[PDB]
């Protein structure tokens, strides 16, 4: 009972300190920057071959190779330039919710409702793709696998916790706890030393991969957070929730900078991605179309559209040349 | 596709696509059903021809040249709103209710109410199974059907009591284009597969009728 009072006063101290740092909103300082106009993006490629809903997609580090997981139980690696299928990996469980690509192109980790993160080796001497390691230890559905190196991966689950794994040994090196709801997404910072995870408790909190410490927590959303992605400089991140609102939080100021809500938007955000410059905030919505937000003025700088069903995944190449979108209509479209 | 190496890469892609289409053909002869219900309600012992295969449990019994795949979602112990949309394309929903449990009956009704009126399952027909007729028949004589349902007013006979429970479950439908196929089952019933088969065939006709434009 006494500690409960201590908990409350600590929140008041944080809120007062957080409010005292606020001097001017982001939309008030950059009011003199000229708008970026209309970003009209045209479909350049249409990747077909999936026979079920597409739930995840990750870009290769060379901005040419893609990976996509679907309910059909197939894992396809695409040549994004010539639309050729490089690999086709049959999964054990057809219920895959996330699917990641290694930064070196050697491995692919891709898992889901089976509570297991399966890692596949592409550069094998036998010419086929084999299941190198199956990571187990999560009691809930898996989401947002992210490779750190060729032998280190961070995973998120519905156990209200995320885990840091060692692919060689197979043991859970570090476990990050503190969420009070299913964790739906995570993103790795460019300096590969920090990451943020968005959970169902309407809170995203910054975690340290080396120490396993919740350095900071961020609030403001009214519903569960569905997606997250860092600003390109690794000093801010953007979240997407079922509240049909996008928000930009700053790690140094510990306060949200601006909101990306529009009166015509009803359905929540599914995916969040940034451009190479950090100016266009692309977000996928449940009303079958993606919107491009000017991340500095909260102005809709065009709409992608085109898809027939809910857009479930977004992806921007490392060089920023193209944007890949996946939806439940079993089609991947590449925009530019 | 100009270079010699790129010509073989295109040949590899076309060979991959052939197997992708072939696997899709073999994935159209199976019926995907969803198992739901409270614990200890017989949701794992409906058909004695199991041929099963913590998390998701599959069951792939076959009947009359048709493949039935049953997905048991129990044991996840997570928020259903985040992964129940994966089963948006299931043919039907199989719900199991235990008539001898007077305490979990209200818990079962909450489960049925949430699932039936879910936004993803607004058109998926439900095959509702009422289990353990004999256990319920003996239980009602010892304790009347009034502690669980204080609003009951009809005769204390088995026929009226069992039908009264059925009416409550169908009172939660509240939607068109959805039909609830009920059936009373016991422990020593072998024709559960036959009951599922005729309901699934009946559900397919309704969806085909809407697609053809007749209705």
């Amino acid at each position, epitope marked *: 009972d006494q500690l409960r009072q201590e908990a409350e006063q600590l929140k008041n101290q944080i809120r007062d300190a957080r409010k005292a740092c606020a001097d001017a909103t982001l939309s008030q300082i950059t009011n003199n920057i000229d708008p970026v106009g209309r970003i009209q993006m045209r479909t350049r490629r249409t990747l077909r071959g999936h026979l079920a809903k597409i739930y995840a997609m990750h870009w290769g580090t060379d901005s040419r190779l893609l990976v996509s997981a679907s309910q059909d139980g197939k894992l396809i690696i695409w040549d994004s330039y010539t639309t*050729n299928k490089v690999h086709a990996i049959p999964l054990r469980s057809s219920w895959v919710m996330t699917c990641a690509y290694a930064p070196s192109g050697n491995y692919v980790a891709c898992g889901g409702l089976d509570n297991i993160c399966s890692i596949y080796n592409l550069k094998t*001497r*036998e010419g*086929n793709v084999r299941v190198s390691r199956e990571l187990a230890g999560h009691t809930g559905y898996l989401s947002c696998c992210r490779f750190l190196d060729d032998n280190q991966i961070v995973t998120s689950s519905g156990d209200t916790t995320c885990a840091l794994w060692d692919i060689e040994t197979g043991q859970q090196t570090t476990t990050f706890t503190g969420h009070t709801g299913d964790v739906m997404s995570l993103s790795l910072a460019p300096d590969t030393r920090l990451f943020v995870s968005g959970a169902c408790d309407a809170s995203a909190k910054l975690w340290d991969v080396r120490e396993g410490m919740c350095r900071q927590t961020f609030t403001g959303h009214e519903s569960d957070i569905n997606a997250i992605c860092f600003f390109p400089n690794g000093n801010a991140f953007a979240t997407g929730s079922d509240d049909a609102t996008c928000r930009l939080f700053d790690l140094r100021a510990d306060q949200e900078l601006m909101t990306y809500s529009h009166d015509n938007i009803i359905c929540g955000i599914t995916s969040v991605s940034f451009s190479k410059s950090g100016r266009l905030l692309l977000a996928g919505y449940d009303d079958f179309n993606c919107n491009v937000w000017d991340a500095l003025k909260a102005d809709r700088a065009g709409v992608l559209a085109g898809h027939d069903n809910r857009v479930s995944c977004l992806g921007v190449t490392d060089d920023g040349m193209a944007v890949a979108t996946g939806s439940w209509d079993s089609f991947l479209k590449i925009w530019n | 596709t*100009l270079s010699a*190496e*790129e010509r073989a*890469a295109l*040949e590899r892609s076309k*060979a991959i696509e052939k197997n992708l289409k072939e696997d899709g053909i073999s994935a159209a002869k199976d019926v995907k059903l969803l198992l739901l219900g409270a614990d200890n309600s017989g949701k794992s012992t409906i058909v004695k021809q199991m041929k099963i295969i913590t998390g998701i449990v599959e069951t792939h019994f076959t009947f009359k040249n048709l493949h039935f795949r049953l997905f048991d979602v129990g044991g996840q112990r997570s928020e259903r709103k985040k992964w129940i949309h994966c089963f948006e394309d299931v043919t039907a929903i199989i719900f199991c209710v235990d008539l001898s449990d007077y305490n979990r009956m209200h818990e079962s009704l909450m489960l049925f109410d949430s699932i039936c009126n879910n936004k993803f399952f607004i058109d998926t027909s439900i095959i509702l199974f009422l289990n353990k007729k004999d256990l319920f028949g003996e239980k009602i004589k010892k304790s009347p059907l009034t502690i669980c349902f204080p609003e009951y007013t009809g005769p204390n006979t088995y026929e009226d009591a069992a039908a009264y429970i059925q009416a409550q479950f169908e009172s939660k439908n509240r939607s068109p284009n959805k039909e609830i196929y009920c059936h009373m089952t016991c422990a020593t019933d072998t024709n559960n597969a036959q009951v599922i088969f005729d309901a699934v065939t009946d559900i397919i006709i309704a969806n085909n009728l809407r697609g053809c434009g007749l209705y």
Partner: single-chain antibody
Framework: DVQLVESGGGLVQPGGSRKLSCSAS????????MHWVRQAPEKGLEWVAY????????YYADTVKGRFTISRDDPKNTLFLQMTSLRSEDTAMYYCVRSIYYYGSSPFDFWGQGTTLTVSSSDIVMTQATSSVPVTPGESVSISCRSS???????????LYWFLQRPGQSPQLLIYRMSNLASGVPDRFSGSGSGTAFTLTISRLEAEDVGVYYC?????????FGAGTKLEL
């Protein structure tokens, strides 16, 4: 362990027919394209025929076009080469090579052990400057060969392959496009080039690097090898 073994060699009379079998054990044979390469006595390597994965696309060399035939038995993991009429030119050590083609693949990594066949009594021309180069260990060696056309495709890839045939062994792939090191080769090897002139450099040469070096083009069929540069110590 990847292993290709060939059998069916021997002494045959002119005008007869022989069949060579290449049984594979250690890799997914059904996904690889298999070539036949023959090496005449102390003359050099020469491409013969190629069958694609799934027996879709088949090619033959102009020398033995319409005379040889290639067949593929995927369930048995065996590759055949039936020769109808044999002259005195057919005598050579026939090798069996696997090849897989996709974005970023290595289509000439593994060569078979080779079988010896003895018989009793337009195209891209690649030329190697020299035939014998004496050198001592620790000294960098540069090997260069030219070509008729420009192997640099419009896609940005240059199709040049460098092989090393140690004495008494089978050729081993070192560089497969212009500078892409093969799997398991030492990092001291490096390659470069510009369109029609290419160079292979070996820094900090070791005693086991001696042998005959061949440069081959894969821009267009038929495949043509170089004259062959021999390193002496």
């Amino acid at each position: 362990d990847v292993q290709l073994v060939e059998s069916g060699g021997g002494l045959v009379q002119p005008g007869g027919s022989r069949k060579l079998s290449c049984s594979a054990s250690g890799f997914a044979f059904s996904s690889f394209g298999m070539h036949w390469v023959r090496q005449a006595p102390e003359k050099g390597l020469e491409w013969v025929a190629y069958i694609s994965s799934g027996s879709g696309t088949i090619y033959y060399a102009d020398t033995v076009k319409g005379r040889f035939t290639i067949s593929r038995d995927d369930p048995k993991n065996t590759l055949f080469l039936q020769m109808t009429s044999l002259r005195s030119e057919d005598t050579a050590m026939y090798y069996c090579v696997r090849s897989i083609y996709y974005y970023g693949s290595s289509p000439f990594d593994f060569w078979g052990q080779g079988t010896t066949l003895t018989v009793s009594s337009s195209d891209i021309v690649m030329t190697q400057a020299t035939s014998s180069v004496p050198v001592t260990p620790g000294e960098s060696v540069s090997i260069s060969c030219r070509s008729s056309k420009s192997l640099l495709h419009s896609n940005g890839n240059t199709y040049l392959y460098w092989f090393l045939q140690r004495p008494g062994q089978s050729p081993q792939l070192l560089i497969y496009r212009m500078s892409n090191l093969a799997s398991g080769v030492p990092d001291r090897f490096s390659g470069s080039g510009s369109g029609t002139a290419f160079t292979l450099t070996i820094s900090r040469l070791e005693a086991e690097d001696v042998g005959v070096y061949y440069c081959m083009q894969h821009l267009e069929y038929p495949l043509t090898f170089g004259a062959g540069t021999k390193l002496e110590l």
